[PDB]
Write a protein that binds this DNA or RNA. Structure first.
Ligand SMILES: Nc1ncnc2c1ncn2[C@@H]1O[C@H](COP(=O)(O)OP(=O)(O)NP(=O)(O)O)[C@@H](O)[C@H]1O
Ligand SMILES: Nc1ncnc2c1ncn2[C@@H]1O[C@H](COP(=O)(O)OP(=O)(O)NP(=O)(O)O)[C@@H](O)[C@H]1O
Ligand SMILES: [Mg+2]
Ligand SMILES: [Mg+2]
Lengths: 569, 381, 202
DNA sequence: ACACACTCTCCAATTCTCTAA
DNA sequence: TTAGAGAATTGGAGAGTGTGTTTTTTTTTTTT
């Protein structure tokens, strides 16, 4: 009956006030926040008692129950009244697990009853619903009662229930072996862990791998009973922004996507898309769109696809899509039959999952127009209306669209106007904020530096790799860039009278010039949407400075950008 | 029906040819099903033994290995030595790279053959499918977009939607042979533009969104618009659009020729090939297959500095010439010269270096790489 | 919808009304409910729940009125009067079946990006009973009513004793054109629940 | 948890037989 | 001659056991 000594070990481990008192402090915090689970770091346990630590990982169940009882006794010794508020306490684990860190592919039947640490990408969820643990019945005519664990009438207030949910984890597709589809596993979430993860999240789950029963065919289904769930995704920024020696926005734009050479204005516009504008609301109930949309058109081999694959790696909550490989149902939402409950419910599509994020559409000119009808409502209003599976609803799909396409006839024709080369409808072309045209002008002076840069890139080898190796199948630093952009997304700067005056006067001047100009010399007409674009771009530039005001410099930069985009051949 | 247990799990995948040893047993009123309990598995076709490594090291060491390999490729087909050399480079491939800012470069090589009927195009495809460690052969006329890349369909059990892999997924890491290439529909050739360059397939259907891998080579065969090449009509023999012609590393034009000496030689070669079917009773196909797999997994080259300098200076001349030809002409050409061609020559230089297990490519290798590209794409342009 | 956290689908709850609380609530109406939350009786340990309701709580003159329409927009003086008379309406004459209807109907043709959106939305906001839709046939419910698994919805239906506004009319389909034609003639529509020829006010 | 089909048991109703009113 | 008590055979009232149970992607012909 050594488990009574094992519980005794855990209780004297938890009583660490004699040695710097970290865990007693954590338990005190748990009490103050009215909580009922604790998170223990396995490194500390391994340091204090090697035998107990190395036994815990290979006997998850029999050891964790002893640990839970030790915690219950310790909190009761601190405060019995608090200990009586909850039926039982729980403990979760963190740290380094060594050999027990696995994936949904490498996890096999020999891991049963070990503590395991699985990681992958979440693909689906069931709905939260209650489960019974103890039921009670009472008789008022006799003052009598009975109980059961898992005449008289049921006592819902003396009975007690707890929450239950199921989710599914999938292997990272980048790590799949050659020529095979990804594998997956089912995770069970219970009590205070429900709804801590949603589809598209990258998670790392700690739990115990276990069979479920099922005459018998001698065959079982295996599930991971979760024990903890984890997610993954100042002075430096202060002194850097305080310098004011140079236009910081130009330096950040120059440093964007170092592999790709040229295309200055495109990089500046993409940085404005990453920073975004700001929303505003009016007393009549109307509101102004804060997010930005961008379109790219051009010849073969001008790095259009690579810029999309870069933004997708350097922005939070970003999604890919290709014109030929996707459907309107897949873009918005699809009805699904739940196998846990049997019920019919909706499942999110690509543009819904990109809410408060970015969505990249490659090969945009190959979509059927019926899909573009779905994209129209999303890009204009940020909402999507659905009328299926007994639900009439207005879902949230607020996102910035970055899209790329190739011109009609494959190679752009100099002897035709922009509206002739571009294959899209004039209604749709009016929705994007900025439209860029890119061309492979075969100048030898430019080919010299381009070819040199490409060849420099192909001779590199990483410092952690040796002279002849080959990989298996399966300027500002990037880290600072991410942190600076992340802080800059809070500032919410405001207009100034001078910037407003400048924008108004300059817009009137631009309108007069456009009135003089002809469709043979412009991509699209200029209207109030131009003012909205100018305001968004000036706001974003002020945001990059972290200046609380929108200044004349921001407005001047914004108008120069749109001037280049609209009034160059 | 087969049952598999303990150490035999995940030893095979579908499409493989295998030999099985097991127990045979049972699982209208009188019907019962039956199946086999497996006790041993042998893949009719493993880690290389030390002896095998010594032989592969010897093959890599000996000095004229390039010609030896060239003669092993499709040995029955008369002539076409340059075409066989290009096929060798396709099988070995360049090298994959991941750059410091996280972007990728594809490494592997795409090849196209276009021209006259009766010139053994289909035979070469039929050989390369057997010579490669991983390979698949399909017809352009008999295939669909959802069949080439990937598909979505409802599970025959349960009620859920499930994913399925097409030809370009099954051949991940190997070669895909597309025969009758000029007889696909336009909207179906559009479907492989992501797979041929970015080597991944992006799907968004039925409430599921994922990205799949396809790291494979494309080898294709086609005719002129007019059935055989008509030199009086020039560029009109080709009607593929520029956005796909630019995704091939090399393009070959094959024309039939009526020289008497070659005809007599070829006739004798054909007749003795037929006659020697009974009488029959340099590297073999099996040996070459294992050698290719070994070289691909162990060796990854890079350019020497001077080799990159030489290639740079050549590329400027090449771009200038192409620009002047289009400027002089009243018409724009179908086969462009772009940065993709600069990368193409580098991939061939790495392949040539890989055959000899050498860590660096050299000016000799760049010279041969430029020669191969000079013949094919500049004859086509 | 505004209470839903980012990137999620909204949820629903069943409410049982009994006794003198019946007939208070209506479809599409905001309410606050007091009740008891309980599990459903069977006939597994996981069970559905509902809310037992105890209380339900719902959440000259011509020139002056013409000048009051869309003052944000410069000019368009008589267009505003036309919209005023659209809201006021004429008279159904009804001489023994030889009917002349009083409802005004008008159409606006706009150049690309012109100010009509502001005027349209002003009339939409102003009118005491009205609805809006767009001709592209979006993923939601259509101009006419629809069926789910009872009948529901439809912009032509939800505006009844009022005015309905159609946007980007030129992108309509033949189904939409025939529906508008039928409304213009008979001011009623038909949708088949399950092959039965049900019909509905418009 | 709630309905058919089947098997089986023990209690006491119906008749034989002997006896008294 | 008419009627009641003691012994033997048989029906059926009752219990126990075993078992069953609209909503999305892809192809093919012919209408445009
Ligand atoms: N300025 C450049 N810097 C770096 N790489 C470049 C540059 N220009 C072209 N490339 C190369 O161009 C190749 C193809 O890039 P890609 O993004 O597909 O071009 P694209 O404009 O999208 N052409 P396409 O996809 O056929 O329409 C890549 O392998 C790049 O290495
Ligand atoms: N050099 C050669 N050596 C041997 N057989 C040859 C040669 N050239 C052609 N053939 C024969 O040509 C016939 C057709 O072969 P095939 O591979 O279809 O050529 P192809 O170029 O693909 N013809 P096509 O499909 O009409 O374009 C076969 O019977 C081959 O044996
Ligand atoms: Mg591209
Ligand atoms: Mg052939």
């Amino acid at each position: 009956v050594e488990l009574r000594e094992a519980q005794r070990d855990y209780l004297d481990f938890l009583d660490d006030e004699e040695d710097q008192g970290i865990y007693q402090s954590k338990v005190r915090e748990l009490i103050s926040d009215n909580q009922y689970r604790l998170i223990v770091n396995v490194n500390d346990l391994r340091r204090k008692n090697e035998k107990r630590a190395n036994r815990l990982l290979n006997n998850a169940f029999e050891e964790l129950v002893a640990f839970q009882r030790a915690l219950k006794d310790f909190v009761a010794s601190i405060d019995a009244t608090y200990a009586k508020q909850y039926e039982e306490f729980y403990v979760g684990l963190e740290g380094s697990f060594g050999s027990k860190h696995v994936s949904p592919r490498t996890l096999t039947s020999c891991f049963l009853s070990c503590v395991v640490c699985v990681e992958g990408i979440v693909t689906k969820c069931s709905l939260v619903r209650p489960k019974v643990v103890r039921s009670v019945h009472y008789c008022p005519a006799t003052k009598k009662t009975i109980e059961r664990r898992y005449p008289l009438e049921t006592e819902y207030g003396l009975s007690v229930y707890k929450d239950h949910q199921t989710i599914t984890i999938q292997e990272m597709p980048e790590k799949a072996p050659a020529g095979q589809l990804p594998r997956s596993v089912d995770v069970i979430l219970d009590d205070d862990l429900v709804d801590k993860a949603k589809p598209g999240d990258r998670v790392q789950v700690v739990g115990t791998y276990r069979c479920l029963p099922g005459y018998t065919s001698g065959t079982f289904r295996t599930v991971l009973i979760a024990c903890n769930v984890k997610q993954m995704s100042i002075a430096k920024i202060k002194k850097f922004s305080k310098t004011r020696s140079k236009d910081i926005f130009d330096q950040l734009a120059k440093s964007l996507a170092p592999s790709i050479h040229g295309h200055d204005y495109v990089k500046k516009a993409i940085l404005c898309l990453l920073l975004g504008g700001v929303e505003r609301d009016l007393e009549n109930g109307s509101h102004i769109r804060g997010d930005i949309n961008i379109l790219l058109i051009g010849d073969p081999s001008v790095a259009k696809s690579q810029l999309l694959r870069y933004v997708l790696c350097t922005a939070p909550r970003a999604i890919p899509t290709t014109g030929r490989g996707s459907s309107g149902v897949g873009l918005t939402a699809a009805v699904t039959t739940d196998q846990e409950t049997g019920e019919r419910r909706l499942e999110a599509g690509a543009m819904v999952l990109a809410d408060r994020g970015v969505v990249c559409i490659d090969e945009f000119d190959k979509m059927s127009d019926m899909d573009r009808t779905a994209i129209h409502e999303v890009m204009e209003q940020g909402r999507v209306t659905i009328a299926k599976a007994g639900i009439h609803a207005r879902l949230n799909a607020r996102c910035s669209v970055l899209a790329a396409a190739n011109p009609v006839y494959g190679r752009y024709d100099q002897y035709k106007t922009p509206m002739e080369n571009i294959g899209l409808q004039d209604s749709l072309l009016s929705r994007f904020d900025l439209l860029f045209i890119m061309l492979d002008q075969m100048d030898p002076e430019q080919d010299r530096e381009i070819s040199d840069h490409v060849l420099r890139m192909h001779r590199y080898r990483a410092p952690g790799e040796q002279d002849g190796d080959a990989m298996p199948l399966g300027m500002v630093s990037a880290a600072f860039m991410k942190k600076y952009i992340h802080v800059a997304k809070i500032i919410k700067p405001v207009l100034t009278q001078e910037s407003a005056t400048y924008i108004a006067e300059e817009y009137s001047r631009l309108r007069s010039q456009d009135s003089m100009s002809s469709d043979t010399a412009r991509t699209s007409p200029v209207t109030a949407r131009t003012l909205e674009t100018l305001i968004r771009l000036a706001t974003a530039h002020a945001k990059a400075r972290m200046s609380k005001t929108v200044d004349l410099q921001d407005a001047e930069e914004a108008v120069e950008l749109v001037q280049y985009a609209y009034f160059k051949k | 029906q087969l049952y598999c247990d303990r150490y035999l799990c995940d030893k095979v995948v579908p499409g493989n040819r295998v030999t099985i040893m097991g127990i045979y047993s049972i699982k209208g009123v009188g019907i019962r099903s039956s199946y086999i309990r497996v006790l041993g598995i042998q893949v009719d076709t493993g880690a290389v033994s030390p002896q095998e490594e010594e032989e592969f090291r010897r093959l890599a060491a000996l000095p004229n290995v390039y010609e030896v390999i060239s003669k092993s490729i499709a040995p029955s087909i008369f002539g076409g030595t340059d075409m066989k050399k290009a096929i060798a480079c396709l099988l070995f491939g360049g090298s994959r790279k991941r750059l410091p800012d996280g972007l990728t470069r594809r490494g592997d090589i795409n090849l196209l053959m276009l021209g006259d009927p009766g010139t053994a195009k289909s035979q070469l495809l039929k050989f390369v499918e057997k010579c490669s460690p991983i390979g698949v052969y399909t017809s352009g006329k008999g295939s669909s977009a959802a069949g080439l890349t990937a598909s979505v369909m409802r599970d025959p059990s349960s009620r859920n939607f499930i994913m399925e892999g097409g030809a370009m997924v099954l051949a991940d890491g190997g070669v895909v042979c597309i025969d009758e290439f000029d007889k696909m529909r336009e909207d179906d050739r559009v479907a492989i533009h992501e797979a041929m360059e970015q080597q991944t397939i992006s799907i968004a259907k039925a409430g599921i969104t994922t990205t799949l891998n396809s790291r494979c080579s494309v080898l294709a065969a086609a005719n002129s618009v007019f059935g055989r090449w008509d030199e009086t009509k020039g560029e009109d023999n080709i009607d593929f659009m520029p956005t796909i012609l630019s995704r091939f590393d090399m393009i070959f034009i094959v024309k039939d020729e009526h020289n008497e000496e070659r005809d007599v030689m070829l006739a004798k070669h054909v007749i003795t090939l037929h006659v020697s079917a009974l009488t029959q009773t340099e590297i073999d196909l099996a040996k070459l297959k294992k050698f290719i797999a070994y070289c691909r997994v162990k060796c990854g080259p890079r350019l020497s500095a001077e080799a990159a300098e030489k290639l740079k200076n050549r590329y400027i001349i090449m771009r200038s010439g192409a620009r002047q030809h289009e400027r002089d002409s009243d018409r724009r050409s179908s086969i462009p010269i772009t940065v993709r061609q600069l990368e193409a020559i580098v991939r061939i230089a790495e392949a040539l270096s890989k055959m000899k297990l050498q860590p660096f490519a050299t000016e000799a290798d760049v010279e041969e790489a430029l020669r191969l590209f000079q013949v094919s794409t500049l004859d086509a342009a | 919808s505004d209470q839903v956290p980012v990137g999620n689908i909204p949820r629903s709850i069943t409410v049982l009304v009994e006794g003198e609380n019946t007939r208070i609530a209506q479809p599409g109406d905001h309410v606050s409910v007091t009740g008891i939350f309980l599990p459903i009786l069977r006939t597994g340990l996981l069970s559905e729940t509902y809310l037992e309701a105890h209380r339900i709580v719902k959440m000259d003159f011509y020139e002056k009125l013409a000048a009051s329409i869309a003052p944000e927009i410069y000019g368009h003086e008589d267009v505003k009067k036309a919209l005023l008379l659209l809201l006021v309406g004429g008279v159904d004459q009804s001489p023994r079946g030889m009917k002349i209807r009083g409802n005004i109907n008008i159409c606006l043709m706009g150049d690309p990006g012109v100010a009509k959106s502001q005027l349209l939305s002003y009339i939409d906001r102003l009118a005491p009973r009205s609805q809006y839709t767009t001709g592209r046939g979006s993923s939601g419910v259509g101009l006419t009513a629809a069926v789910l698994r009872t009948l529901e919805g439809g912009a032509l239906v939800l505006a009844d004793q009022g005015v309905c506004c159609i946007d980007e009319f030129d992108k309509m389909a033949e189904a939409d054109r025939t529906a508008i034609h039928e409304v213009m003639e008979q001011q009623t529509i038909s949708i088949a629940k399950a092959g039965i020829l049900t019909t509905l006010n418009a």
